């Protein structure tokens, strides 16, 4: 059996069992759009290649709906695009992979009138963010009870995978597809609380993110995307202003410059 | 601040001042021929020969370069050009060149490749 799921204002709603009338029959979804930055010049060969991005794609779910009556049918295709035609942009996900969901916008789609009482449908999502992320992010505990992770989501079967660290110098794993930037409108967040003044340093990318100013331990440092703060107020003033990205597979991180240090690692896995 | 890196010229100027930072700063660029680089709010102040520093990197054809255009223009082509110095105080008593201690033509060797193209003559009164 197939079902579609909806994140919506907070809450999740299956498909089928909003509408009993409509049942999903088929999901599919298109493959990644990579487009290259062609240079060409002219009297050469082929072109030079810029840095490969990912366009938005299109994920599709074939259904139809069996309604009672005519005015049954009518009344489920008014309340059936009402409920999926909204002012902003929502989330979906499919029974087949629980475990990885899509922002989506929807995309006008007309039913196809079959006989009086059954219409066939095939309703399209774009999905513009041009990637998958997981369902739960990094803090979330890979335990069976949170019934959030599923298989295929390059968890690695050979070492634990925990995501917060209480030393100076770990590893990190970034299971997503996509190195994590929050410059490219990433989501990634760090809460650092320790004593003195911190240096995060990430050897296998190479970055360093310093804050100047001595902190305690009842101070937490937030970095959530490109803005450095303590206890919610911004202090880029007195930092560097580097900001640290994850490398696909295992990151080495290093701090400097504080003692007893606690450091926890909030950021969804990038798929596609 | 302001440093200065090379060697430059002197130049004579006339009631120096009444004028802004940076168009003091564009007059000197003028004047001594100097080319201005800021490091945030710290100018420094080249010659020709300090400014430019040779690299290996080139400029290929087919290899890096795309479209090049070329800009030639010859409607100020002159080759020769008359020019007069102070006048004299019996201007008007005097007749001719003569009425300044200074009158000079010059003429660049290039009229050997374009003639002689003589120019409207310019007066300096210093």
Redesign the interface.
């Known amino acids: 059996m197939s079902d579609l799921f909806l994140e919506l204002n907070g809450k999740v709603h299956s498909l089928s069992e909003t509408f009993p009338g409509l049942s999903v029959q088929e999901v599919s979804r298109q493959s990644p759009q990579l487009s290259m930055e062609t240079a060409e ?4 060969d082929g072109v030079i290649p810029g840095m490969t991005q990912f366009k938005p794609f299109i994920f599709s779910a074939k259904c139809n709906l069996q309604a009672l009556d005519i005015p049954d049918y009518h009344l489920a295709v008014r309340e059936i695009y009402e409920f999926l035609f909204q002012r902003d942009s929502y989330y979906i996900w499919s029974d087949q992979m629980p475990g990885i969901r899509y922002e989506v916008h929807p995309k006008p789609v007309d039913f196809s009138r079959e006989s009086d009482r059954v219409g066939l449908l095939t309703i399209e999502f774009d999905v513009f963010k041009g990637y998958a992320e997981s369902r739960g992010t990094s803090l979330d505990p890979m335990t069976f009870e949170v019934d959030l992770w599923q298989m295929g989501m390059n968890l690695s079967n050979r070492d634990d995978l925990f995501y917060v660290f209480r030393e100076n110098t770990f590893r990190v794993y970034n299971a997503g597809s996509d190195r994590v930037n929050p410059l490219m409108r990433h989501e990634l967040d760090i809460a650092m609380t320790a004593n003195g003044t911190p240096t995060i340093h990430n050897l296998t990318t190479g970055e360093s993110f310093e804050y100047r100013k001595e902190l305690q331990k009842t101070d937490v440092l937030l970095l959530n995307n490109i803005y450095p703060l303590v206890n919610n107020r911004r202090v880029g003033k007195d930092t560097n202003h580097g900001i640290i990205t994850l490398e696909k597979g295992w990151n080495d991180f290093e701090i400097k410059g504080v003692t007893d240090v606690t450091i926890a690692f909030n950021f969804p896995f990038i798929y596609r | 601040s302001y440093e200065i890196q090379g060697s430059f010229p002197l130049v004579e100027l006339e009631d120096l001042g009444n004028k802004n930072g940076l168009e003091l700063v564009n007059l000197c660029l003028e004047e001594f021929g100097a080319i201005l680089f800021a490091d945030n709010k710290k100018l420094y102040f080249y010659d020709e020969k300090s400014w430019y520093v040779r690299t290996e990197k080139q400029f290929r054809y087919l290899y890096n370069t795309e479209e090049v255009s070329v800009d030639t223009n010859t409607d100020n082509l002159k080759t020769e050009i008359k020019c007069y110095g102070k006048q004299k105080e019996n201007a008007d008593k005097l007749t001719g060149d003569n009425k300044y201690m200074a009158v000079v033509t010059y003429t660049s060797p290039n009229e050997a490749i374009y003639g002689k193209r003589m120019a409207n003559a310019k007066s300096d009164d210093k």
């Open positions: 010049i002219a009297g050469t």
